[PDB]
């Protein structure tokens, strides 16, 4: 069991993932890195339930050895070496691609596959969806008050008030899951709406859709 730590974060439940092996600390590449590896690291450290798995050196770049790459954790592995990956040291990555993690510490918001980030409270912020163990934003193409309504009622935040575009509460960072969201307005969840296939889009993160509810 390798040993892990979080570095260059605001605290010690968020930061750049670093593992220990052969007396040397090294970073972890973000190929195949997602919430399955994230919940393993948060559990080791005693930091909780793995809010997100930021790619591309969110908390700065490490220096020196890059131990692991192409991690394929099932999510329940005791430590990070108990996962299937490329052999120690063998990688074609670069330190810009050092994977990070954000843990809860004690307070417990996952539920469920939908969340609003970057707002004053739960019921305001851009929209993020949970798909294939990665959080991702929603492009504002075709994004109207009906689409934000489905988000508001799924979160129990009452009715929709606005549906801001152009990343009103700030841009996303890694994955853009949905584009061309075509809701009738009375769907249960956002994944029940008519939209493009998961992952397909013609967008960048300057176009992440938001949602404002009451309140």
């Amino acid at each position: 069991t390798a040993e892990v730590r979080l570095v260059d974060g605001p605290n010690r439940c968020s930061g750049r993932v670093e593992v220990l092996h052969n007396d040397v600390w090294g970073t972890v590449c973000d190929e195949g890195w997602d919430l399955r590896e994230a919940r393993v690291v948060c559990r080791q450290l005693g930091c909780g339930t793995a809010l997100s798995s930021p790619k591309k050196s969110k908390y700065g770049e490490g220096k020196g050895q890059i131990w692991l790459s192409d991690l394929d954790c099932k999510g329940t592995e005791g430590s990070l070496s108990n996962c299937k990956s490329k052999p120690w040291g063998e990688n074609i990555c670069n330190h810009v691609e050092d994977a990070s993690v954000e843990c809860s510490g004690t307070e417990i918001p996952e539920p469920g596959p939908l969340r609003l980030v970057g707002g004053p409270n739960r019921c305001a912020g851009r929209v993020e969806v949970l798909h294939e163990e990665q959080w991702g934003s929603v492009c504002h193409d075709e994004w109207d008050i009906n689409d934000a309504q489905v988000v508001c009622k799924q979160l129990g935040c009452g009715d929709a008030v606005l549906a801001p575009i152009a990343a009103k509460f700030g841009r996303g960072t890694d994955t853009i899951w949905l584009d061309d969201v075509n809701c009738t307005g009375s769907e249960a969840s956002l994944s029940e709406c008519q939209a493009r296939p998961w992952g397909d889009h013609n967008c960048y993160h300057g176009e992440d859709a938001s949602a404002i509810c009451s309140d």
Partner: protein, 146 residues
């Protein structure tokens, strides 16, 4: 698009040593001042009024970092580049209205930037590999232009 074992090793080898934060920031800045007609695409970046102001512009450095970073997804899948930039290909056409011929300019500038920072590790055979890489990535971004 067929890669040789030595061409992959030349691209993998460089990619592990590139100071992407700086090379990407300098390549994008060199685009904006070698070919200054590209500044109209980046009007939201603010102060583009001199070569010194463009190097120091934090949003030019931020976006340039994310551009050279995106060649990383081509580096880590060399034999799958077309699908890796399917997303960005639609973006630059029917969201940004970028003439695909401009892709050549940024890519050829990246070669001059990489040459500057690797001096004599950037052998002609290493340049040939990364010229092919730049050139394939540019063809991938132009693959879906309606």
């Amino acid at each position: 698009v067929h890669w040789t074992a030595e061409e992959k090793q030349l691209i993998t080898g460089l990619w592990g040593k590139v100071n992407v934060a700086e090379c990407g920031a300098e390549a994008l800045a060199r685009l904006l001042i070698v070919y200054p007609w590209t500044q109209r695409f980046f009007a939201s970046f603010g102060n583009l009024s001199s070569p010194t102001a463009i190097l120091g512009n934090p949003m030019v450095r931020a976006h340039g970092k994310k551009v050279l970073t995106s060649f990383g997804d081509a580096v880590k899948n060399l034999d799958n580049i077309k699908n890796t930039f399917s997303q960005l290909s639609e973006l630059h056409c029917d969201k940004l209205h970028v003439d695909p011929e401009n892709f050549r300019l940024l890519g050829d500038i990246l070669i001059i930037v990489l040459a500057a920072h690797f001096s004599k590790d950037f052998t002609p055979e290493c340049q040939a590999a990364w010229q092919k890489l730049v050139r394939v990535v540019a063809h991938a971004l132009a693959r879906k232009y309606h």
